[PDB]
Design a protein around this ligand. Structure first.
Ligand code: SF4
Ligand code: SF4
Ligand code: FES
Ligand code: FES
Ligand SMILES: [Fe+3]
Ligand SMILES: [Fe+3]
Lengths: 633, 633
């Protein structure tokens, strides 16, 4: 079972699932083997009814698609469509928040409101919306309107790209025609240009993909901006993670999916309705997080994280999960089937994301509180139905310190230098205490034993004094293995990095260091790491492709993460990926993405499946950046 | 070779290509066999890096995707993405025209202009834009702005759906939540909802697809509206088709692709520069059409149609095609490779549609005339390089009467009844002279011997007194086999239909009947057939799903045609398709699309590969509609 997951709590429930005959994602993966090699290499195309077409990676025919499409064209078209799908997912999430803010400040969704006035005002100034002399509800309405405007063509390009990156970076991107004109405009243009009998030039295709990946960055950043306005900018918090955060005695309610517009309300209302859970014989309502919406409520409210990504079914297998509350993205549809065996009430809430067999509760922002009550009452009723039934919650959990927004990181640094808060961090980069910065992002993937790449690469980089920040299921993987607990700084961190984490933590009145890894939030909160690295770049007067900053999507899965890794490359970062995407069937495409894209953006993909080697290659990329600045390494 | 194409001119060049060793689409198809059965049935998914996943249509594992996605979910997700890609293609075409009109009436593209004032004004009134008291350049600017606005969310739904369909049809669609909110908004929402771990309910998924197919209808209709404003509403014209329209002595220039913003300029300028072709020893500049942009210039200017779709390489094989001028969609990328052997200069002109090996001439509307000259001069130079070289143009051509816009059809009918022009057509429907109406649309497909379904179904329906209208490569197939020549009315048409075509033609001062099939234009001009059938529905006070009107995508290929067939079903038509899309791996999905969608929209797909049976099934659907009106059949 340790070949399936490195998580001991996950291993325990794989054993339960096996003896109870419940099929798991790993069983379904086993049943899928050997997987198709055409699809695995990218040498397959179904973009018209003359297909499916395939190309032998080596040997005799077929060598070309029926229409004449080459291996490099087919491979670039499929990758482009992946980026556009990811962009669409982050786009719909941000759009949802934009509509919610608009409804809130027009008196239509009274359950929502401007909770962060400081963020609202700083966003308006970033965008050049006037603050002085304007009411907050009118500033917010203007900000919401500008968010919605970035989805279509207009007189300006996408502001959630051009106002968030260093200006030298925007200039370099504009010179190559890479600045998105509108978020949904780029998505549609990708779908067009990759359809049959359109764009048939690998380089042209890939440049379109880089541009669309910046449409995804825009959606992430606007998702983060809007969620902070509506729900508060995260600040450091302490909580726990892994399955041991379930309580046999309480009504265990999982928020699962991505968008907090729903889950943030569930958190708030659950607190009020906890007298009503006691009436049914539970201690209360134990709200726990799964996947990114769990990260959202962990980052803002300290909701404990139950589990993540590939292992999400395992929360159900305990027998104690009374309800799983879904919006969209990364929900294994199997949870609807597994619920028949575990008793869990699975509830979908968004019109465009239903699962056959799951209870659907239409959720409307105008009636959010009533909807949350109806859903929490279904959870209460399910906990009743399992009173007396035996549960197996693995007694396994870790301590998690999280909530490291870019605002919170800068504020923490400000305690060392009040008027130049980035200077102490840069000072320790220059003197070697911080070797560089690595962002871990993305998913788990059934192809990789869960968390194995994340923890192995992280252990090695931390020893080498790398400041590690993490998001999404990368943060989930690290937090479930102890990397967000300050008690592990001595074991995990190098002396230089420990010095820095200790100085900052003690200067923030903690008596202890910062945790070994800084949790910066959900997948859209990859935008927070951009905001930080862009702030570092601007204080130093250099572009991102000169900073000792790298990224690792060490176990990635979703089209969203493909878009993120592409925009990490596009904004100039060396970007390690731990599962090969379907590109190896074209050497020219692989070469563009791993080498010659350096000449355009300064970033590049690092393909490396073995995580020890991956850590070496990431350190090498960090140290090459150090040298280009004339720094010791 | 007659197993490859029923076109005798195409057969002749297949023989030339074979002996010269030039590989063709049919050779590439042969080399692709046996094609993958997972993809053919739709039981394959690559929407995340845990894939590729497949499902055995029958038997043992794999039975489900790794994430738990069922066969019905995988099949519905892939179909949805096809509709969105088609919608994106018609969207980008319409968007292009919208930007051109805006530039034209703002003094930025002086090569363009309001050529059809009547169409401009009637569009403004359809949309409720004010005409009386307004300048034309200001009405047009308002119309262009409303076109661009329909791509994103706003206070109104997509007007190029809600103002073009019968109001009872809009009401039925709204009740099911099927009205698009914005064109690129629906495209992005499809891409989101079909990504991993989102929508996992076949019915929910398919309803999203119907809605996105109406976003495609909107793009088609707005493409037709804008092209008519800018370039003129088509009116009846006479010209020729097939390879025999090439002339060994002239500079033969093919316009190929979809968007006339480019090709309409090529037509105009080529006329001026024909003294300059004589200086190089050609009789002139023979502009000919391929695919839909050829239909556009055929419909408006009587440019002869060279060939279409699957057989487009064959124009090159003659040796006399000096240049092929491309914008996007349905261009086999093989033309760039074949040009090395035939001498043809292949020229791409749009930034997002390049082919490796082809000459790229950036085309800008602000400099359209200079660009057209540079391109026509390359054609002139290539004709020089082949003086003395021997050519093999098959001496095969047909007479084509075309240009039957809905305006032109109504005007022609008006000569029989000036104040109630639709009444004579309805009168002959009621009395049986016209059994019903069939639209042929879509592509050729290498899987079907070229034109075989189109001509066989058409021959049978015309004998049974069906009024046949046709667009795109369906019109191409019919026109290359003589169905647009009035001299064939006696052989092809039934006595009732002949009576009607004769009465209308003679009343329009022709001494002869209308041609056996009415050519209504390019693929986006499928919107013209909607406008006609909606006008018929409104005059009768019934919805489209009560009219004896059907459609046949008899040889379809492109994601665009998948979107068109879906919106034909969505607006209420029985819709025959001659190549199975990848859905047969899910009985529940096949059942929705072929039967139970009747209960939602009144339309339904008719899957039928054998064209004789297809004609029987189409007649049965027409006759069932007749009966529901209490009409004799
Ligand atoms: S687009 Fe070309 S390569 Fe793809 S399925 Fe169609 S014919 Fe084959
Ligand atoms: S989305 Fe599901 S079915 Fe598709 S490739 Fe990923 S795991 Fe497989
Ligand atoms: S041939 Fe297997 S992914 Fe298409
Ligand atoms: S298994 Fe062949 S299309 Fe994927
Ligand atoms: Fe996740
Ligand atoms: Fe065509």
């Amino acid at each position: 079972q340790n070949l399936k997951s490195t998580d001991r709590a996950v291993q325990q429930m794989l054993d339960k699932a096996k003896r109870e005959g419940i099929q798991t994602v790993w069983d379904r993966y086993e049943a899928m083997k050997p997987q198709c090699g055409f699809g695995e290499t990218g040498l397959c195309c179904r973009h018209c009814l003359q297909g499916p077409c395939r190309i032998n990676p080596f040997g005799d025919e077929p060598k070309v698609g029926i229409c004449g499409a080459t291996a490099e064209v087919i491979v670039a078209r499929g990758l482009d469509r992946s980026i556009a799908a990811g962009a669409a997912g982050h786009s719909g999430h941000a759009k949802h928040l934009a509509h919610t803010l608009k409804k809130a400040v027009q008196g239509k969704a009274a359950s929502y409101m401007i909770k962060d006035r400081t963020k609202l005002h700083s966003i308006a100034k970033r965008l050049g919306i006037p603050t002085e002399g304007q009411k907050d509800e009118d500033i917010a309405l203007e900000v919401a309107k500008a968010a919605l405007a970035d989805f279509h063509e207009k007189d300006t390009p996408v502001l959630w790209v051009t106002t968030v990156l260093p200006p030298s970076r925007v200039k370099v991107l504009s010179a190559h025609g890479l600045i998105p004109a509108g978020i949904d405009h780029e998505i549609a243009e990708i779908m067009h240009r990759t359809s049959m009998g359109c764009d048939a030039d690998a380089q042209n295709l890939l440049l379109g993909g880089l541009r669309c990946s910046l449409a995804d960055l825009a959606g992430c950043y606007m998702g983060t901006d809007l969620a902070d306005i509506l729900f508060g900018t995260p600040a450091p918090v302490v909580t726990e993670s892994n399955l041991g955060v379930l309580k046999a005695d309480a009504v265990n309610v999982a928020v699962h999916g991505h968008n907090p517009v729903l889950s943030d309300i569930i958190v708030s209302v659950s607190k009020e309705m906890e007298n009503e859970a006691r009436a049914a014989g539970a201690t209360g309502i134990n709200v726990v997080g799964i996947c990114c919406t769990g990260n959202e409520v962990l980052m803002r409210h300290g909701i404990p994280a139950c589990t993540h990504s590939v292992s999400q079914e395992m929360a159900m297998i305990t027998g104690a999960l009374d309800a799983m509350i879904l919006d969209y993205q990364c929900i294994q549809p199997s949870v609807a089937t597994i619920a028949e065996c575990t008793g869990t009430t699975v509830i979908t809430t968004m019109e465009m994301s239903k699962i056959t067999g799951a209870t659907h509760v239409n959720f409307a922002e105008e009636a959010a509180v009533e909807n949350a009550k109806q859903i929490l009452r279904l959870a209460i009723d399910t906990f009743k139905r399992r009173k007396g039934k035996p549960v197996e919650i693995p007694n396994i959990k870790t301590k998690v310190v999280a909530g490291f927004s870019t605002e919170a990181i800068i504020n923490a640094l400000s305690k060392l230098n009040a008027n130049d808060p980035l200077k102490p961090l840069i000072d320790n980069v220059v003197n070697g205490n911080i070797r560089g910065v690595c962002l871990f992002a993305g998913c788990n993937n059934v192809k990789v034993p869960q968390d194995q790449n994340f923890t192995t690469i992280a252990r090695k980089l931390l020893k080498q004094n790398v400041l590690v920040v993490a998001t999404g299921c990368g943060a989930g993987a690290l937090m479930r293995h102890g990397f967000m607990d300050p008690a592990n700084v001595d074991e995990l961190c190098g002396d230089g990095l420990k010095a820095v984490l200790t100085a900052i933590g003690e200067a923030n009145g903690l008596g202890g260091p910062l945790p070994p890894v800084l949790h910066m939030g959900s997948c859209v909160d990859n935008s927070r790491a951009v905001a930080l690295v862009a702030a570092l770049a601007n204080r130093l007067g250099v572009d991102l492709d000169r900073l000792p900053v790298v990224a690792s999507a060490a176990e990635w899965m979703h089209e969203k993460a493909v878009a993120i890794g592409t925009w990490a490359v596009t904004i100039g970062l060396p970007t390690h990926i731990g599962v090969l995407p379907p590109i190896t069937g074209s050497l020219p495409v692989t070469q563009i993405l791993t080498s010659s894209v350096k000449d355009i953006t300064g970033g590049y993909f690092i393909h490396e499946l073995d995580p020890e080697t991956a850590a070496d290659k990431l350190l090498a990329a960090i140290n090459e950046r150090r040298a280009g600045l004339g720094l010791p390494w």
